[PDB]
Amino acid sequence: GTSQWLRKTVDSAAVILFSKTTCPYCKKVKDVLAEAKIKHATIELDQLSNGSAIQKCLASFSKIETVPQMFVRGKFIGDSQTVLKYYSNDELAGIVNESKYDYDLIVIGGGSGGLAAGKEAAKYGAKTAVLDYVEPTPIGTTWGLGGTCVNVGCIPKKLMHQAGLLSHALEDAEHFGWSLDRSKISHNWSTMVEGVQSHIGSLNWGYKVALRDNQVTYLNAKGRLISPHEVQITDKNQKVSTITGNKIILATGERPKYPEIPGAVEYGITSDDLFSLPYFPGKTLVIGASYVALECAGFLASLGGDVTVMVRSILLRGFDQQMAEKVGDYMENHGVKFAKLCVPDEIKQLKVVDTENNKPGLLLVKGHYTDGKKFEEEFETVIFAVGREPQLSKVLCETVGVKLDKNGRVVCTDDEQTTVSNVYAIGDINAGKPQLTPVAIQAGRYLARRLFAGATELTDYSNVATTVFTPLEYGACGLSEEDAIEKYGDKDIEVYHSNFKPLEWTVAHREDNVCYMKLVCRKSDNMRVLGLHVLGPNAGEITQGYAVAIKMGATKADFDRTIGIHPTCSETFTTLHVTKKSGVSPI
Amino acid sequence: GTSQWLRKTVDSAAVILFSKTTCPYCKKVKDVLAEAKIKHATIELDQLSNGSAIQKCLASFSKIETVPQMFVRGKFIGDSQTVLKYYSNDELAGIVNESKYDYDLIVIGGGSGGLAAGKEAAKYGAKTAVLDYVEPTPIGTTWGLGGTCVNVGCIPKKLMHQAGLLSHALEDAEHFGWSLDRSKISHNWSTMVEGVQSHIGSLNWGYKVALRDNQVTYLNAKGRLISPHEVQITDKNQKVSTITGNKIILATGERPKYPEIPGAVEYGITSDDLFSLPYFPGKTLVIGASYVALECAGFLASLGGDVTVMVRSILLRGFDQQMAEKVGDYMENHGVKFAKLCVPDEIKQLKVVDTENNKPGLLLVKGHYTDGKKFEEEFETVIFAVGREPQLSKVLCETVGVKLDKNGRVVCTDDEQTTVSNVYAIGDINAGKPQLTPVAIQAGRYLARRLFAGATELTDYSNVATTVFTPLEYGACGLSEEDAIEKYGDKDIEVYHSNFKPLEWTVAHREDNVCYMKLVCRKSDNMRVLGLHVLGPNAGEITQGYAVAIKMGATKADFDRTIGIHPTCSETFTTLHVTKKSGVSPI
Numbered sequence A, B: 001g002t003s004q005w006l007r008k009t010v011d012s013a014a015v016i017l018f019s020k021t022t023c024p025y026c027k028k029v030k031d032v033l034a035e036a037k038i039k040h041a042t043i044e045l046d047q048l049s050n051g052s053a054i055q056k057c058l059a060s061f062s063k064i065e066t067v068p069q070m071f072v073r074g075k076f077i078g079d080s081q082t083v084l085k086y087y088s089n090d091e092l093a094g095i096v097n098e099s100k101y102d103y104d105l106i107v108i109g110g111g112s113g114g115l116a117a118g119k120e121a122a123k124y125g126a127k128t129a130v131l132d133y134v135e136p137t138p139i140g141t142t143w144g145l146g147g148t149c150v151n152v153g154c155i156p157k158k159l160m161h162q163a164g165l166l167s168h169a170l171e172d173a174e175h176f177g178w179s180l181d182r183s184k185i186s187h188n189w190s191t192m193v194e195g196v197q198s199h200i201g202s203l204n205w206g207y208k209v210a211l212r213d214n215q216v217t218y219l220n221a222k223g224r225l226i227s228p229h230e231v232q233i234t235d236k237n238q239k240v241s242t243i244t245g246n247k248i249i250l251a252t253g254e255r256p257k258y259p260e261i262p263g264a265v266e267y268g269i270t271s272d273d274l275f276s277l278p279y280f281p282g283k284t285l286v287i288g289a290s291y292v293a294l295e296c297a298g299f300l301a302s303l304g305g306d307v308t309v310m311v312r313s314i315l316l317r318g319f320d321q322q323m324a325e326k327v328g329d330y331m332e333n334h335g336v337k338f339a340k341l342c343v344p345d346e347i348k349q350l351k352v353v354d355t356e357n358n359k360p361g362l363l364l365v366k367g368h369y370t371d372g373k374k375f376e377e378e379f380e381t382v383i384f385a386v387g388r389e390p391q392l393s394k395v396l397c398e399t400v401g402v403k404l405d406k407n408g409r410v411v412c413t414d415d416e417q418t419t420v421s422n423v424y425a426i427g428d429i430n431a432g433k434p435q436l437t438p439v440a441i442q443a444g445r446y447l448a449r450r451l452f453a454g455a456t457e458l459t460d461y462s463n464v465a466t467t468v469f470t471p472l473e474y475g476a477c478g479l480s481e482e483d484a485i486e487k488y489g490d491k492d493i494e495v496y497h498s499n500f501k502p503l504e505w506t507v508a509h510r511e512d513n514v515c516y517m518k519l520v521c522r523k524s525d526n527m528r529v530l531g532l533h534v535l536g537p538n539a540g541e542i543t544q545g546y547a548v549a550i551k552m553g554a555t556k557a558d559f560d561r562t563i564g565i566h567p568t569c570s571e572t573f574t575t576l577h578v579t580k581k582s583g584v585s586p587i
């Protein structure tokens, strides 16, 4: 029980000190290590319920039961007199750096998960390398350190969403008494992109500085795992070499897919290209119906674009479909066109992009609906958002022995371990996990603590809240209504719902009865809240706090007994009373 | 136990049906009452754990143990055959309307609490009257039905706050690529006020329609409780009459105080006057430091005003004082001036308000600091925000026997009962309770259900969340840091905190390290979250959801195990790690 925890902690930690808060001899070692700038984990036995049991088991590794005890890479190094002997003899540095591998930890991938894992590991004295390489898109687009979210994901996406939201703010300002001539207002795409990219650049730079300041080795190199402990790296001069590592974290993420049709790769673009595009896309076709497709279509329309979304079947597959339809209805009522039950067959080039005068080209898109009928229309830009895929070398991962699933993602235990015992996987390539930035970050940080600081806490992947940053935002935590009904049966599900109107929308003359929220509850479990859903402004800020309560097992009664904050949109969750079964209107 | 619950329910309900969901004879009575449009409460005994015990005790009131049983104002009226005998004989209407008093419920006051209580009571067949009268301010300002929040409180305040926030949005829009000439943009106060007042008018109208549609008698009359069951009303022709009621709810609220100095009443105004003021206040002095003082000063400055706040001692007394200082620092850095440790002595008139050309007057304010030094400066408008007070006739409430405290507020039990057994008090006049609109609404609705539908649930007044809508908003739920330390001692309090920067502020070039959040936790109680505090945009939307988790007893570990939504401000609450005791910088 505790002896198997101690065994795992001793074997895996790079540099660890077993201590007690009140222990002058422990402080002597702590001060020596701090003066030597030797980073390490510290476990204060007096603060653990099984502290006394741990102190006894330590003798199985050191032949002593006292504190302090210092370990390096699985080996007891000494008590205080011994550590200080190494110190005063200029021997300690060599002792604590001795290793069978080049690194304690090699992270392949410098994105959300990998940077979090590598920084956290270094905190405990793990000798750490982070590898990051950004393979250029088909048109040649590349970017700096930080991964998908920082460079071509959440960060630029939400900044362009804000630019789009500011359009409504300009409209609203007049109703609130501001005098501005909107005949004269227009949007400049390249000025926005320059501001977005300046911020991204500050993040690229910040991550580099952070790795330096934590003594992490950053290699701008492509990595390949060729055996359980061997990573082959290729640098930008195409020099190939091998580095070894005790633990390996795979954190390589995904990249956009293209449909297998003529012209897609040559003439279309993806979200990878959009966020640094030097020209305004112009009349744009977005192919796909994911949150990325709808988010990008949404802000392009708000920035003055002529935008069409081509939808194969449904919107936001995997999300609550009542909410998805309300998201789409708002977009269609606010300037976004939809080509329904339609797929593309080929992209034909009519004009080449004019890179010197910074203007888009022109394309002919041919496709068809499922009545067999044809689709044919011209667009300046075609954006594919038809899913993302991992890029793992299946033949290579096989020969190392890392098991992948149908889709090319890594099959992991609940502590992120692959089928190779020293190799772990985090983030978007971890099969079955929500593909979100804070998930990758929590997984990587928590994994690093287990590996190098004796922690036991696992990442909890259930009831992870999300927000779709469409023109009217959609936040959710927990089950869709249809998923709850499938699990438990319609007679065991109660749904409370209401429309609402933000107070800000009254003077602005925006819509009554578009914003909407519901709670999906389980009758036979004290009206447990299984899922929360809100369509409205600032939906991510609304949703976040409730995710804590849902993780704690909130019931409808817990929402009712809480008092609202007035005036807010969120307070409507504390006074819901109309049930769907009652048939009463939610207006 | 259950017999005393039944006794109380039978005695207090106006019209109540004891039933079981599966009971054709109950449905026969239900359909008759619905066809007769007789409103009533219904208790389905099969849905109560003590249902069988209740069914037996009913024989103590009716001599029968079966369902259905119908009661009116404490008297068993009959089983199904009997009710249907009354129906087919055109006798039922007279039966269910027979009463010793004119009304089952008289509500004195038509604001947040009173309207909620009166509407909810009528739902269960209580014959209900709501009295509302708005005594004019010293300069003659009056308004319609709905109370303080609707007319001169949360609603207009937050709409003018939004007008102020739109100023920053105009500035931000340029950085996000919008081209607008801000040399040419200005704000028109009267256009804003017209829009705000149009919305308020729609609310006045809506409440009137709602009372009509619920068959509540609305009297625009001043009410006085002259004996436990007698309310003297004075209508707008000054006709005096008396109405009687079984239960009385006092819900009369508060009005602004004036300092006892020469010129205050004659020449200054309060928040009652501000929200319909026909002229822009101009150069304004706000006397006071409450949330009302700072909210009003904040939006007046953002709308182009020259604004000074005169502070006797501290800001936001009763709120967390670290947060209060951060609120004030932001205001002082964004255009609001403060006269510190200063009080007024007299207001002198230099120019009369020009009502015909809609322009303010001019005033001379004389005051002093606590070094004895003098204050003397001219202002166009002087707004007092030095607290609010109940307006109850202490001599009258005494002779009826309703006990008041030091401050003139009503001393109530935990079920809102006064010292007179049929008289209750809700909202701002209920001593010791948080003076907020959703508190008054919950108290009134929950009271109405206990009185007329057999409910037992009490209003929970603990950990009620709040938000101060200053230019940078401040949301809070639970204890201030200083209150937690006083209760439990510094060694038992841990505070986790962080600065943050909204992503929206990056491209807009707004401040690093002004937005701020902290969690005040109790070490010896599993790091229980005692108080949550956030300074930032949309602070009310951020805070609300956490209030559910805090009511459920959230710990720091419950916050940590929850995954953030990215990118949001709120997600920072899920990754806090810097403690104040550590001394580490929260930047």
Ligand SMILES: Cc1cc2nc3c(=O)[nH]c(=O)nc-3n(C[C@H](O)[C@H](O)[C@H](O)COP(=O)(O)OP(=O)(O)OC[C@H]3O[C@@H](n4cnc5c(N)ncnc54)[C@H](O)[C@@H]3O)c2cc1C
Residues within 6 Å of the ligand: A108, A109, A110, A111, A112, A113, A114, A131, A132, A133, A134, A135, A146, A147, A148, A149, A150, A152, A153, A154, A155, A157, A221, A222, A223, A224, A251, A252, A253, A254, A271, A292, A391, A426, A427, A428, A429, A435, A436, A437, A438, A440, B565, B566, B567
């Ligand atoms: C348009 C878009 C919008 C999004 N919006 C949100 C949002 O709003 N909120 C949210 O939570 N999530 C959002 N996401 C998802 C979020 O971006 C991902 O969940 C997150 O980036 C995954 O983190 P990761 O560490 O697994 O992978 P990544 O961030 O993709 O990092 C992987 C890194 O490893 C590099 N790499 C790949 N192979 C190698 C190799 N052999 N050697 C070295 N380096 C390699 C990759 O080039 C990359 O830099 C969005 C995604 C997209 C595409």
Ligand SMILES: Cc1cc2nc3c(=O)[nH]c(=O)nc-3n(C[C@H](O)[C@H](O)[C@H](O)COP(=O)(O)OP(=O)(O)OC[C@H]3O[C@@H](n4cnc5c(N)ncnc54)[C@H](O)[C@@H]3O)c2cc1C
Residues within 6 Å of the ligand: A565, A566, A567, B108, B109, B110, B111, B112, B113, B114, B131, B132, B133, B134, B135, B146, B147, B148, B149, B150, B152, B153, B154, B155, B157, B221, B222, B223, B224, B251, B252, B253, B254, B271, B292, B391, B426, B427, B428, B429, B435, B436, B437, B438, B440
């Ligand atoms: C500037 C300001 C801003 C505020 N902002 C917020 C906020 O943002 N969020 C929040 O939760 N709270 C806010 N409040 C507080 C909120 O307005 C009060 O908590 C709420 O209005 C109290 O409700 P009530 O029913 O007790 O009293 P009221 O709403 O004041 O209603 C009492 C009614 O009874 C009338 N009346 C008085 N005497 C009689 C009589 N003898 N006969 C008949 N009628 C009578 C009164 O004129 C009034 O109409 C604010 C208050 C102010 C002044």
